[PDB]
Design a binder for these strands. Structure first.
Lengths: 118, 125
RNA sequence: GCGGGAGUAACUAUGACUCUCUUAAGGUAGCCAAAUGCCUCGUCAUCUAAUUAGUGACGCGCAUGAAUGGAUUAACGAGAU
RNA sequence: GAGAAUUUGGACAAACUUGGUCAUUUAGAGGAACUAAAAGUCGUAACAAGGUUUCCGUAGGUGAACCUGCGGAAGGAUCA
RNA sequence: CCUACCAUGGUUUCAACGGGUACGGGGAAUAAGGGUUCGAUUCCGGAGAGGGAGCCUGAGAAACGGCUACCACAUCCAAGGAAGGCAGCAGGCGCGCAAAUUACCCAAUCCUAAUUCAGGGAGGUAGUGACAAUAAAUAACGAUACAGGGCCCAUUCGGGUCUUGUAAUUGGAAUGAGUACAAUGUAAAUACCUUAACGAGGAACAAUUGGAGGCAAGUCUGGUGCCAGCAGCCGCGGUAAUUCCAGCUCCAAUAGCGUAUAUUAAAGUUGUUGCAGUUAAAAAGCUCGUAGUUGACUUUGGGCCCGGUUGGCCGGUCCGAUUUUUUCGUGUACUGGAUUUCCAACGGGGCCUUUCCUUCUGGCUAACCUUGAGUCCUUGUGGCUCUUGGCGAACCAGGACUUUACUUUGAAAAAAUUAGAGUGUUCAAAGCAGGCGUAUUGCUCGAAUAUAGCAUGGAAUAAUAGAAUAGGACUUUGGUUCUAUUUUGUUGGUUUCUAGGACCAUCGUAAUGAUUAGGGACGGUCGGGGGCAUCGGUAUUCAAUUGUCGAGGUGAAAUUCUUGGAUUUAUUGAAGACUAACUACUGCGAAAGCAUUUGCCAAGGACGUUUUCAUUAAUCAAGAACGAAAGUUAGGGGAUCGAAGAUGAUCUGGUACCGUCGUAGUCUUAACCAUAAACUAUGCCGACUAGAUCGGGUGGUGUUUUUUUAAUGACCACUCGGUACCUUACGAGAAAUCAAAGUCGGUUCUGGGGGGAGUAUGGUCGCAAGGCUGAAACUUAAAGGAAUUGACGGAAG
């Protein structure tokens, strides 16, 4: 048949499959800086997946600066940057870390605050 | 020959020529212009001698908004007339599609009365 | 025939660039530990019962450089691992 | 006359082993390039006619953005 | 299916074969539809049972719970040797974002075995989880007391309507669930349903989540200070933060709320319906031509193909039972939807076909589909009239009836007119129609087949040979003989009818409407289109010689050139390149491109009366040929100017501009590479719509030129082609502007954010520099076009 060569829409995500989230055993906990318009050291982790086996960097927001996501943490990894564009301040991250989840539930939640959860 | 045809008579009505001056003769010109006469879109017509082919005469009366051809002569059905009548005529109630039916060249709603399919030539509204 | 001494970039670490002395005046395209390397089992990957060859580079160039020429690049041998 | 077991011969299906050839993936000496990022080095190329009008194609040469030969364009006003 | 032998074919750019990927359909999601994306559950079909092999048993198997040998795994074992395969249910381990009990049962339905009745991890049920939909839904009433602000009315005294608070307020009523008792249906089990009375307990079984700068309903105060933090986008946080954090303060929805996945919509952003290309991304450098796609035109039926509309299955409605619009079953009708392939009927569109025709001689013989009009009948609409159901006319559509008519020929003085003949064939059945009981004939309906004759072929007619069929005469009953009819082959005279071949004229009028669409021959004509061979002039340079003493450059300068006589002035000789003026708002060539004069070979365009073949045409991926300049190879040549290279000057530097010299190039033949901001930034071809200049042809009964008068002219009217172009109304567009780049078709090319990139890699071409074809990771939130204001200039006035 006829058509010009159309490419289907591609999410800029190195994990694939048909899965929302993913487990990952982690290497290190980093604290990287950012691009031009904003300062502050923003926290990240080097998540290596089990099923897919890809190296990704993920932003860990939390009300805990040195919150527990260590070297060998079984952390759950979601989207945010898969959904929408990738983040402006600290580029490279396009994955956000989920709280208290997975099989083992090692990575902790937002602490020192007593507004409703999230 | 099809392209030019309905554009010449349309531009005549746009400016407001009382008679329009058109010409050819062999055997796909004049009886849908009698369907136009029945519907009250044009008036009278006659024939004048030439050296080769012929000369027509058509009397107008300031009716045509846009007529034009359907340049590929597509197949119309006795159900799907109005898929074309949607885009061909921007108005419904006004205008008609001229089908080249199996029962000669006639109107589209007349074609549903006979229950006859065919091809298409042009629109008038 | 084709240079020395001195000072200098966040931070381990380096010298872009700048000054000064000296002489007639101080080198490009491209490549490197050599039929040439004091220093050197240098430094790294792969191979091997050990394996420095096979083959992968490192930069720590005693002392690479366009006509008695760099460089593109197929065929052929009682010649070399 | 029949059944079991043994031997010889014919034809069929597919596996296993060895060699050659092609594609893909991983490890990898080694080699070339890009993107992002503060400060620097050297020149003023581009930007007003930026004080030699620019840019693009192509060829040669230079520490360096570059300079020069040749052609053309308006991406200099006006239809050069 | 298989082998032996023989032939050499078969398939393929309408995509073979290979590689990668994938079960397929009914269907499911989204959408207005077109379409796009999927193939879970259900249902139908195929294929598979640790791996690989083979067989038996049997009607059915090369067999999940069958068998044998072999291999790998894990297991038992007296070590001799055996026994195994959860892609059946429940469950274990591992994988993962992640998905449920080692439950109950044969009652009901269905399958298996005379019935009883037994078996079923099929199935009918239960348990687990907001997983989703759904309903109840996140709660709502009659009555009374008091306080505050707003509005209608007011006799101003109050009264009415009406609710963010408040009170041990009062009367209460109400579900969901448990428990005791009664009553009910199926049971093998777990949990029992429904109504009423009485007592007790709990209570509409605890309401949370998200947002508050714009997009997107909703702001204030504290605290923190680029930190802690939030971020889908653009962004916010470094002291007065509606964006962080907490409060109170608001908005929206609610048993769900937010996030994440992924498809579709938004998206007319892959355009079939339904997209752009002068300047934003986009016409291939230009010609030419094959396959392919498309097709001016008269009259026709058949054949072929495309496209319906109607009937077959399912659902709803209709009917019966029933409380029912639940649901089930049967029959019929209507309506809607689906699988997209076959048959048949009915009207098309596109596709295909000839004046004429043996000859002395006579010229001989014969004819049209259909359209249109009229009349009758039938249907629908509207008007008048009836509570509503009747009537006359017009018009639409369908059917029937209908000839005048058309034509080849004769007789006529001509001719009116008249006389004769014709307007398809065959077969079976069913209906109606002359005379008769019928038969049979004619017409209509439906099919099949074919659609100018005289070389040729068929029939009639005659002869002869073979075969078939019927009747008669005979028969030692096989057969012979005669006659009639049909069919096949062959021959001849005459009569009648049918195919096929060559060549030419005209364009008539009815179905898209001011149409000569393709190639030239004949005769005149223009041009810097091409290649070669000659020739002329000016300027420059070099060489030789005379008369005569310093020049050349620049902003100043110097390198440089001169007393060994330069510049120069004149004469003489030589070598190469270019052609001032004419020269243009000019012409030619499809584009690249083309300037002295003359000659030869040789091409194309435009005009004119015509003559003439008769769609021959248009366009065209691939393919073929041609190619400015720069570059390369081999052999020549080098006057005039010069990349590279060498000196002088300038400057902070000056590897440049400037000045003095000078190499390759620049020129030439042959061969190659093949590109340019290769341009009108606008594809080719054909028809519609007001207004210059150059070339051809015609006219100007008048005037001028002028002595081979050719004035080719002057100057004016037109009529055609090219159309430097100018200028402009309608109209279009985002606008500048265009005058089609407005607007239309047939066909071909091309675009889908910027950077990465015309790069990487492979293929292909090249002698080599390099050309052609041609991405992604990743980065980012914009790049870009049209149009404006103002500052500035070693810009102007």
């Amino acid at each position: 048949n006829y058509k010009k060569r159309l490419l289907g829409t591609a999410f800029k995500s190195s994990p694939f499959g048909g899965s929302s989230h993913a487990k990952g055993i982690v290497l290190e906990k980093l604290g990287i800086e950012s691009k031009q318009p904003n300062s502050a050291i923003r926290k990240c982790v080097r998540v290596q997946l089990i099923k897919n086996g890809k190296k990704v960097t993920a932003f860990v927001p939390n009300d805990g600066c040195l919150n527990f996501v260590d070297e060998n943490d079984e952390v759950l990894l979601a989207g945010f940057g898969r959904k929408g564009k990738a983040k402006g301040d600290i580029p490279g991250v396009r994955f956000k870390v989920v709280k208290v989840s997975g099989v083992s539930l090692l990575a902790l939640w937002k602490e020192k605050k007593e507004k409703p959860r999230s | 020959l099809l392209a030019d045809a309905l554009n010449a008579i349309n531009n005549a009505e746009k400016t407001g020529k009382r008679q329009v001056l058109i010409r050819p003769s062999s055997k796909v010109i004049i009886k849908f212009l009698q369907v136009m006469q029945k519907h009250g879109y044009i008036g009278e017509f006659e024939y004048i001698d030439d050296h080769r082919s012929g000369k027509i005469v058509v009397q107008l009366n300031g009716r045509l908004n846009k007529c034009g051809v359907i340049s590929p002569r597509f197949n119309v059905k006795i159900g799907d007339i109005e898929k074309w009548t949607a885009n061909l005529l921007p108005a419904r109630q006004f205008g008609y599609v001229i089908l080249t039916t199996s029962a000669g060249i006639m109107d589209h709603e007349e074609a549903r009365r006979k229950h006859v399919s065919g091809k298409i030539l042009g629109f008038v509204y």
